[PDB]
Each structure stands twice: as structure tokens, then as C-alpha cells.
Design a protein around this ligand. Structure first.
Ligand SMILES: [Ca+2]
Lengths: 732, 406
């Protein structure tokens, strides 16, 4: 049964399991349950569309109101949050089931009861007031979500004194936002004020349409892109916009500063959730600032389904929102897990704006773009091209982990990820430079170790043999810093130019790339700056072809061979040991980003993902039933793989490889960190549903990897497990 | 800008070179340019993405050449010759010739063009046999990042030109979605095997997973098949085999091929409706071909065997009409003002829409009042290409409905 069906029937275990399955499908749903009225509008959408989906029958009457929180008693500022009050009553019944939904562990007040009885007796005048028995339920979410059936109470104790909106009303009436519940209860109201307080609380009947939406997801789960496009154009999007507009008054009334963004996405999600029990609907939200993206995939149980990328705009015209959907869909291999679950090359893009009466939506088809960005190649051709510099900027920023906040407190984390990823990409790229003049050139790479041990600045030198030289800088905002000495480079040519490309991560945590400056011919650059040379050593990057060869065997035939993995990291250690004091690996973020860029820059594997969420675990807690009271608590803890490697399907086994990383300060702490990582692999072994849609096989490989910052030789830099084999996890 | 925007900009720039007295040939050749550059996926855009000035004028000279065109389709044999010359029209060739010789199967030039690249790359490096093998592999791995065609021809152990049997080359070209490779190895097949291999390739690519790069291969193989009746009967045995063939051909503007196939129960009711919407979607994407696209729509609309299909396509049910989008896009095209079309053409487009509307009223007169409202809501709720902003296109439908009721 569906979510709303189980909830309306009082099936709390069925609803809990049903809602747990939806949270698997929408792995970021919990991040937004407190953003405005995201959660109340979500459950309202499910209720307001349940009849058209044949979940609820015509004789089941649904009444709802938004119990808006109003003024904050702490500081006097208005809030844009609320509770959702919903009640359901079947015609020939005596039980009225009342549901209070919010993001804090609220009940139906006396006035909400009276208004509800008034509304129910209007629809069925054959009833006496003493015929209606009330069951009260609660759904609250804050890593914990609880479903609750209230006790069987008697008399006036069955309902609360005031709703949230009643408290706001009375605080406005008394011109004092600081009044508590007890202080408000002590003040007297006149007859007019009591009647006003009655009008402020009223329920609206959910009135369904004549259109059935039973088979809407049948059209979105189609393997034909024209079918997905046309169904969205002339059917599905029209229904969603029409249903939202039919309740626009209740959504926009008695609230200021509502998050139209998070309420738009909640309404769309609630529509999709009414189908989550009949289809496998993975949903990827990106509601970070300046981003309003929803991408989802509708599957019956398959790998050839069409991704749908929607951009929900609140004030932008329809064509602008569509372009943002197009732009987001092209880079979907970077931003989303949806390309992992389907082999489709094309996606359907939707720009949507509920606040428009003319062209609220527009649809187009866009092809997925390969995420094979060659950083070193693009660096050489960006010297006089602002467009390529913007591409480079986006390449570094868009590969950051999404769950790392871009605030001032996480500056070092962001700076470690960008420098580590850029280093891993450029130091381990084996390809030569493709020149404009129908030619190629071997590239000798270098990394500079500054004299200042605390200068946040990554400096690298790229020398295309016979062509130009490019110095790359990735500095912090406060990196107050002469010229880089280039005497160690074997340069024999009177036509080599030295270029400098500087990148800065400013206080706003946006990557600003300066205008690339030509510093002159090589010998002129060296003749000058003779007294302007910065203190430090220019270390040459070792040859890395053994890394790519061993990495090719690990991704493919040596998939489950422990020795193949050990040889890979022995080669990585051997390549990094001459550079350990220069690259300065001082955080787990830096170590992860280096390996991320190292795997990305290699032709194998096809995809490498950092901080990939594979799913969640749910720990339940049930209270013993006491006088009809039921309490079910579900605690949720996430499971993320630090690195995930995947092979190109052909045999459709993607050979999934997962690496759990730890950073050790010395050789003594390696044992604790390795044991600590094997415990995290143990918890990862419980996750199964998250591994099925990424591969057609039945097994996944997991390894614990430890970096030792105090190593003196490559044999002790990256530690690999030397008992029973514990790296093959079989799926069911 | 998006990658699709950059390809469309390059396509429009290259289409400036298409000149011909017949305006239908101009439109057909422009769509061929778009396929060459690429629409949803990069095709030759990767090799020309930075081209400006004389580098663009070089491509303009190749595309203005009548010798490079076979009707509205590109002559791959001629292109391989032009793209491997050192100079055309006094302008040096800006393309990497080894890449072009690989793409266009100029097998006479593949190996010597590769030697020049190999030697210049080797000489930049700071056993002589094993090192040369390493340099060769490094060069092939570097170029192949742009596709498997760029290491298909060079043996990695010896450095010699690879020699393929025609069957092996044909299969590999279909696997690579390598249009020019299919045509080359097809010419080297045994005459006894040609009809069979064409059938194998058509059945292999006609699937729900097909992409736009399958369309040129499907167009080539269909037009070489002598017995199209047996091909359609075999193709009808695969799931969505006939749909995938027709759909990809329609979306790549191979209208002449679809026309011949229609003139010659092979698809379902939904497939018929998707043909109409794909044809009208392409109509708005390529307004210079709206005449040919409309004639293909009216052909699907006038087939006597498809009398049942056309009836159900206008049957309003569950607050929707299967063809509401098709009517909407025909009205958008009728009222397009970004291209030039005489008042006679605009009158012919209005009549087409009026006749189709009269068929919907005649088939379900009790439903025609809702049918009119759904078409109006479609024109008011869905933005489309070629549809002017802030203009109530629903009024254009209401004008048409009033004229029908007189
Ligand atoms: Ca419609």
C-alpha cells in the first residue's frame, strides 16, 4: 500500500516502512525538513493528489490547514515555518483521524476541533456531534523521525489549548511577542476577539479533480525519450501546476517570507512520493544556495530509463529556468548519482515556475556530457581564453563534496580539496600536450616547496618539451607572496615562453583565476628575477606510468585480487614519497582529493566518485502501547564511501571498488586507524539496497587505506592490509 | 554557455556556406551540417571547436563545394580528400590530417600521416625499438581520447597499417557508431553478403537505446537495402524496432527516407502518436524544413490502414488528447515570424490545421468542446521553440475555432 493509504488506515508500521523506503529513494530529503515549509507542503501535496492517484476514495473527505508558526517569541521576527493539520473522515464512519505534521516533537487545538466538526457535519448532516470519535496522530522529523498515535483522552484534555496560529494571533492582538502560553491563557478576550480567533482557524476541503493520474509514472518510466518528453509536455506538468494553483490561496495566505523555493520542491516531491510504493524513483535534490535542481529516475524495478532534470524557478522566466536545467543536466555525471543508475545518454530537461500564468513550464532534450576534463591540456589553452578559464574554475569547484559547507569555518577543508584534486589530476596525467600546430609534446611536471612552512599556496610547473612553460598557483586569500626559479628545467630553445596562471580562493570561497601573464622568454625570465627568486626547492614529479598500468589491472581483471590493489598503492606511494614534504598532506580531505584526482586523470576507471552516499541505516525504537498510545522512533545514520571506482559496462558488472580512508600522524597510530576503518567497512557491509542500482553483478570490493604523515620511505607511506579475507561484500 | 549552445553556434556559422538555387536543397544541406557538427552529442565539433577566421573559411570552402555533396547528404569520399589536402582556396588546412584520414578512411594516407606525428613527437623527448613502441603507444592513447577511430588503423606492436576483413571492419564501424567507417567497409563486402550485413546493422541499432549518431548509419543502410518489405517484416519482430528506426530518422531530418518507408500492424498506437509529435517537434527545431516535415505529418495522417490510429489520436479522454501537443506545435509554426514564408504558405498551413480540427469534431462531437479547451491550455502552459514570449497563443487557437464554426 501507499504512504497516504497506510497513514489514513492508521497502519503506523506500514507507513513507517513505506516512508523509510522513500528516504532511500531521496537520499537528501532529511537535509531540508526544516527549510521553510518544505515538510508541511510535502505532506500536503501527497494528500492533495492522493484522490487523483486512486489512493483515497471519493467517500474519504480530507480537510487541511497550514498552522503557521508566525512571530518568534525569542526576538519578535516572523517565521516562515508551520505545522500541517490534516484530518480524514469517511462518510459512513464515526472515526475522524487527525494528523499533525511538523519538524519538531503541535496537537489539534479545541478551536481546530470545532472548525473540523463544523466542516464534517456540513458534508454529512445525518450526524450528531457525539457520534464523532477522534484519533490523533503525529509525524515529526528533526536524523530522527517519529510516528505517534496519541493516548485515548477524555473531556477537554483531548485537544490542546491553542494552535500555533492562535498563539501568533493572540500575541499580535496583545502587542507583545514575548508572552508565553501561561501568560496568554491569563488574559481575557471580549466577544469580538473570541469570534475573530474562531475565524483565524478554519480547514479547507481537499476537492479532487476528474483527471486520474494512476498511470503517470508509467509514462516517465518509459525507455523511449520521446515518450518521457511528450508525457511531461501535455499531461504531467499541466496537472502539477494546476493542482498547485487550485490551492494557491491556502499556501500564500497568513504567512510572510515563505521559501517559495523549498515549498515548490516539496510540492513536487510530494507528487512523486505518491508513487514511491509502485516504482523505484531515485531523487537527487540540489537545493544549495543559488541552486534549485531536481533530477529523478523512474524505474519499474532497469538500467535504460530516461533521467528527468527539473529546475524550479520562483521569479525567473520559463526559458531561463530551462537553460539552468539544461546546464545542470549536461554536468549530471559530476553532480548526481542518476547517471550511475542508468546507461541513458540523453535526459529530459524541465524549467518550471509555479508563479506564472503564461508558459509556467517548457521542456527540451539534452545529451549527457562525458566528465573527462583534461586539466593540464586545458591549462595550456586557457592562457588567452577566458572561457576555458571559467571551465577550469568549474572543474575544481564542481568536484568538491556537496556536503562540505562553503562557509568561513570550512575554508581549510575547501582549500585542501581543491589543491589536492588539482595536484592529483595534473601530477598523474600521463598524456602529452596536444599542440595547435598538428603536434604533440612530452610534459615534464614539477611542484615547488616554498620556504614558508605555513604558506597556503600550491605551486606547480608544467614544461612541454619544446613548447612553453606554465607556472600554476592556487593560493589562499591571505597568501601574501617573488618569482619561481626555473634553472633545474632542461630548456634548450630561444623561443620558450614562461606563463603564470594564479588562482585564489577568496573570503567568499569562490575560485578567481587571474589573467594569465606572459613573463617573457625563458632566458629573459631567468636573467631577470635573479634577486627575486623565492626560497624553496623545485621537485620534479616522478614517472607515473606504473600507476596507470597497475590501476588498469585493478579496475578490470584484478578486480577482487588483493595483491593487485596492494601493488597499486605501492606505486602511488612510490610516486608520492619524493613529494610528501611539498604536497603537504595534513588532512583526510587532502589525502582523499589527491587519490580522487589521481583516479580521475587516468583512463581507468570510467567513473570515480568522492564522498558517495550509498544509503542509510535505520535503528528503530518502539514504546509499549499504553491506553492506545503508540510510539515508533526511527534514527537514521548515513553511510558514505570516501572513494568509489566503477568500470564502463559492456558484461554489465561495473566492478565497484570502495576505499575507506584514514590519516595517521605516525607509524604507531596506523594500527588504530586501520582498525577504525575496518569497523566502518563492517557497517558498510550492512548496506545492500544502495549497491544494486550501480552494477549488474553481485559483489563489491572494499578496502581500508591509511596515510602515514610521518613516513620516511614509500614502503611506510600508504599502508595496505597485509586472517580471513574481508574485502569482498556479496549482494543479495 | 552549454556544450549544446556552442555546437548550435558553430553549426549556424558553418551553415552560412550553404548556397543553392533550390531552397529545399539549402535546408536539407543545413541539417547535414548540424549532424556533422553534432546536436545532442559532439560529432566533429571536437576538432573544430576553437576555429575562427580563415580556419572557419576553410570549412566554408569545403561545404560550398558541390563536389562534396550527394544531394542533401555529404559525400564522405570527397570530404576525406578535402580534409587531407594541405591547402584549399589558398587557405592552409587547419585540421589534424591524421585524425581526418582516420575518420574518412583515407587508407592511402593514414600511415604516412601518422609517421610525421610519431617522428615529431619522438624528437621532442629529452632500446631504440622498445622506446619507439612506448612513444607510439603514448601517441595513440593521447589521440584516441577523441574516439576509438584514432587507434583503429595503427598496429601497436609493429606500427604498420592494420588490415581488416570487410566483415570485421563493418561490425566495428557499427559498434563505434562510425558512419564513415560503415560506408567504407560496406563497399568492400562481398556482393553476396551486402544485403545480410545491412540487415544486421539495422536490427542492431534500431532499439530504444539508440542515439542521434545511429541515424546516419540507419539512413545509409536503409537506402542500400533492395528489399525493404522483407526488412520491415524482420524489423517488426524486434521490440520497438520499427519505432526506433522511424524516430531516429525523423529527429535527424532524414525525411526522404521515412517518406519512402511509409509509402512502402508494424507499430503500435503509441508509436504512431510519437511519430506525429517527433515530426512536429523537429518542425519547430528546423523551421526551414517545416514544409517537408508537414508533408510527412499529413502522410501519417492520411494513411488508410492507419484509420484506426488517427481516430484514437484525436479521442479526448481523461482530460487529455494524444495529439494536443501536435496541434499546438502546428499552430506555433503557422504563426512563426522568424523565417520568411509567403501569405500563400501561411494560408496553406492554416488550412492543414483546420482540416485536422474538423476531423476531431467529426469523430467525437460530444467531446469537441473539451478538445478545444485542452488545445488552448496546451498553447498557454507549455513554452516551445519558435513561440514568441508574452503572447497568448491560445487566442490563435480560438481564432481557428471560430472560423471552423461558421
Ligand atoms: Ca494537456
Amino acid at each position: 500500500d501507499g504512504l497516504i493509504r497506510s497513514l489514513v488506515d492508521g497502519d503506523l508500521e506500514g507507513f513507517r516502512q513505506g516512508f523509510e523506503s522513500f528516504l532511500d529513494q531521496c537520499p537528501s530529503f532529511l537535509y531540508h525538513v526544516s527549510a521553510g515549509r518544505f515538510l508541511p507542503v510535502f505532506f500536503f501535496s501527497m494528500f492533495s493528489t492522493a484522490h487523483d492517484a486512486n489512493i483515497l476514495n471519493a467517500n474519504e473527505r480530507v480537510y487541511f490547514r497550514f498552522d503557521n508558526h508566525g512571530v518568534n517569541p525569542r526576538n519578535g521576527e516572523n517565521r516562515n515555518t508551520a505545522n500541517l493539520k490534516v484530518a480524514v473522515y469517511r462518510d459512513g464512519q464515526q472515526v475522524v483521524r487527525c494528523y499533525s505534521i511538523s519538524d519538531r516533537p503541535l496537537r489539534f487545538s479545541t478551536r481546530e476541533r470545532n472548525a473540523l466538526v463544523q466542516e464534517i457535519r456540513r458534508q454529512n448532516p445525518n450526524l450528531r456531534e457525539e457520534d464523532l470519535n477522534f484519533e490523533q496522530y503525529k509525524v515529526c522529523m528533526h536524523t530522527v523521525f517519529e510516528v505517534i498515535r496519541e493516548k485515548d483522552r477524555q473531556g477537554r484534555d483531548k485537544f490542546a489549548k491553542y494552535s500555533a496560529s492562535e498563539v501568533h494571533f493572540l500575541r499580535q492582538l496583545f502587542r507583545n511577542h514575548r508572552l508565553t502560553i501561561k501568560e496568554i491563557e491569563g488574559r481575557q478576550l471580549n466577544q469580538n476577539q473570541l469570534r475573530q480567533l474562531g475565524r483565524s482557524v478554519n480547514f479547507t476541503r481537499v476537492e479532487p479533480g476528474q483527471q486520474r493520474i494512476d498511470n503517470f509514472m508509467e509514462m516517465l518510466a518509459s525507455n523511449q525519450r520521446q515518450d518521457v518528453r511528450d508525457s511531461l509536455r501535455g499531461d504531467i506538468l499541466e496537472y502539477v501546476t494546476d493542482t498547485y494553483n487550485n490551492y494557491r490561496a491556502q499556501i500564500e495566505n497568513n504567512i510572510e517570507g515563505r521559501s517559495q523555493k523549498f515549498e515548490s520542491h516539496g510540492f513536487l516531491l510530494g507528487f512523486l512520493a505518491n508513487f514511491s510504493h509502485r516504482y523505484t524513483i531515485g531523487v537527487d535534490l540540489d537545493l544549495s544556495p543559488r541552486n534549485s535542481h531536481v533530477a529523478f529516475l523512474v524505474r519499474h524495478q532497469e538500467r535504460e530509463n530516461i533521467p528527468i532534470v527539473i529546475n524550479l524557478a520562483t521569479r525567473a522566466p520559463p526559458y531561463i529556468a530551462l537553460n539552468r536545467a539544461r546546464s545542470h543536466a549536461e554536468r549530471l555525471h559530476v553532480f548526481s548519482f542518476i547517471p550511475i543508475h542508468t546507461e541513458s545518454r540523453n535526459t529530459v530537461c524541465v524549467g518550471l515556475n509555479f508563479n506564472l500564468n503564461l508558459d509556467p513550464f517548457s521542456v527540451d532534450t539534452v545529451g549527457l556530457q562525458q566528465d573527462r576534463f583534461p586539466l593540464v591540456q586545458r591549462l595550456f589553452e586557457c592562457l588567452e581564453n577566458e572561457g576555458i578559464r571559467e571551465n577550469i574554475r568549474d572543474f575544481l569547484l564542481h568536484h568538491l563534496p556537496a556536503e562540505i559547507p562553503r562557509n568561513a569555518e570550512n575554508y581549510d577543508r575547501i582549500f585542501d580539496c581543491i589543491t589536492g584534486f588539482a595536484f592529483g589530476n595534473s601530477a598523474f596525467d600521463r598524456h602529452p600536450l596536444e599542440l595547435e600546430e598538428e603536434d604533440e609534446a612530452p610534459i615534464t611536471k614539477y611542484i615547488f616547496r616554498h620556504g614558508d612552512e605555513g604558506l597556503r599556496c600550491l605551486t606547480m610547473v608544467f614544461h612541454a618539451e619544446g613548447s612553453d612553460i606554465v607556472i600554476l598557483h592556487i593560493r589562499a586569500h591571505d597568501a601574501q607572496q617573488g618569482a619561481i626559479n626555473l634553472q633545474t628545467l632542461n630548456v634548450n630553445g630561444n623561443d620558450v615562453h614562461v606563463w603564470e596562471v594564479s588562482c585564489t580562493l577568496n573570503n567568499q570561497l569562490e575560485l578567481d583565476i587571474d589573467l594569465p601573464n606572459d613573463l617573457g622568454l625563458y632566458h629573459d625570465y631567468q636573467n631577470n628575477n635573479a634577486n627575486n627568486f623565492l626560497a624553496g626547492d623545485l621537485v620534479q614529479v616522478p614517472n607515473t606510468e606504473n600507476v596507470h598500468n597497475t590501476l588498469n589491472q585493478v579496475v578490470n581483471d584484478g578486480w577482487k585480487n588483493i595483491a593487485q590493489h596492494r601493488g597499486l598503492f605501492q606505486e602511488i606511494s612510490g610516486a608520492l614519497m619524493p613529494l610528501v614534504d611539498t604536497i603537504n598532506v595534513n588532512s583526510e580531505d587532502k589525502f582523499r582529493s589527491i587519490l580522487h584526482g589521481t583516479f580521475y586523470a587516468s583512463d581507468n576507471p570510467y567513473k570515480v566518485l568522492a564522498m558517495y552516499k550509498v544509503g542509510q541505516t535505520y535503528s528503530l525504537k518502539r514504546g509499549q502501547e499504553e491506553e492506545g498510545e503508540r510510539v515508533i522512533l526511527t534514527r537514521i545514520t548515513e553511510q558514505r564511501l570516501d572513494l568509489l571506482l566503477l568500470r564502463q559496462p559492456r558484461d554489465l558488472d561495473t566492478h565497484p571498488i570502495g576505499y575507506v580512508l584514514r590519516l595517521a600522524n605516525n607509524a604507531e597510530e596506523v594500527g588504530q586507524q586501520q582498525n577504525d576503518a575496518r569497523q566502518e567497512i563492517g557497517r558498510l557491509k550492512k548496506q545492500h539496497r544502495g549497491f544494486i542500482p550501480i552494477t549488474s553483478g553481485n559483489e563489491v570490493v572494499l578496502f581500508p587505506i591509511v596515510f602515514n604523515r610521518d613516513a620516511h620511505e614509500a614502503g611506510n607511506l600508504i599502508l595496505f592490509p597485509e586472517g580471513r579475507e574481508e574485502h569482498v561484500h556479496r549482494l543479495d | 554557455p552549454t556544450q549544446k549552445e556552442l555546437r548550435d553556434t558553430m553549426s549556424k556559422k558553418l551553415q552560412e556556406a550553404i548556397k543553392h538555387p533550390d531552397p529545399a536543397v539549402v535546408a536539407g544541406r543545413k541539417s547535414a551540417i548540424k549532424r556533422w557538427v553534432g546536436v545532442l552529442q559532439d560529432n566533429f565539433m571536437e576538432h573544430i571547436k576553437y576555429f575562427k577566421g580563415d580556419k572557419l573559411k576553410f570549412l566554408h570552402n569545403v561545404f560550398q563545394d558541390e563536389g562534396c555533396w550527394s544531394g542533401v547528404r555529404l559525400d564522405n569520399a570527397a570530404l576525406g580528400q578535402r580534409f587531407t589536402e594541405e591547402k584549399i582556396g589558398g587557405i592552409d588546412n587547419p585540421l589534424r590530417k591524421y585524425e581526418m584520414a582516420c575518420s574518412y578512411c583515407v587508407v592511402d594516407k593514414i600511415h604516412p600521416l601518422f609517421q610525421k606525428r610519431f617522428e615529431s613527437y619522438r624528437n621532442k623527448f629529452p632500446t631504440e625499438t622498445e622506446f619507439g613502441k612506448y612513444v607510439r603507444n603514448s601517441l595513440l592513447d593521447s589521440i584516441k581520447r577523441k574516439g576509438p577511430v584514432f587507434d583503429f588503423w595503427i598496429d601497436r606492436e609493429s606500427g604498420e597499417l592494420k588490415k581488416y576483413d570487410a566483415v570485421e571492419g563493418f561490425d566495428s564501424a557499427v559498434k563505434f557508431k562510425w558512419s564513415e567507417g560503415v560506408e567504407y567497409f560496406y563497399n568492400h563486402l562481398k556482393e553476396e553478403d551486402k544485403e545480410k550485413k545491412l540487415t544486421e546493422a539495422i536490427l542492431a541499432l534500431s532499439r530504444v537505446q539508440s542515439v542521434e549518431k545511429d541515424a546516419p548509419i540507419l539512413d545509409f543502410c536503409v537506402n542500400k537495402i533492395v528489399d525493404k518489405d522483407t526488412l520491415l517484416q524482420k524489423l517488426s519482430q524486434k521490440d520497438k524496432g520499427v519505432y526506433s528506426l522511424f524516430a531516429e530518422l525523423i529527429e535527424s531530418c532524414f525525411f526522404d527516407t521515412v517518406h519512402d518507408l511509409v509509402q512502402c500492424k508494424i507499430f503500435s498506437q503509441r508509436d504512431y502518436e510519437l511519430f506525429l509529435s517527433s515530426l512536429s517537434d523537429t518542425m519547430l527545431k528546423n523551421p526551414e524544413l517545416s514544409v517537408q516535415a508537414r508533408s510527412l505529418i499529413m502522410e501519417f495522417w492520411e494513411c488508410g490502414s492507419l484509420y484506426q490510429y488517427r481516430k484514437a489520436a484525436v479521442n479526448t479522454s481523461n482530460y487529455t488528447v494524444p495529439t494536443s501537443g501536435v496541434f499546438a506545435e502546428l499552430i506555433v509554426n503557422w504563426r512563426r515570424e522568424d523565417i520568411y514564408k509567403t501569405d500563400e504558405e501561411k494560408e496553406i498551413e492554416k488550412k492543414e490545421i483546420l482540416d485536422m480540427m474538423s476531423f476531431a469534431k467529426d469523430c467525437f462531437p460530444e467531446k469537441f468542446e473539451l478538445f478545444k479547451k485542452l488545445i488552448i491550455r496546451d498553447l498557454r502552459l507549455c513554452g516551445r521553440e519558435g513561440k514568441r514570449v508574452n503572447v497568448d497563443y491560445g487566442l490563435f487557437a480560438e481564432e481557428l475555432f471560430s472560423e471552423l464554426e461558421k
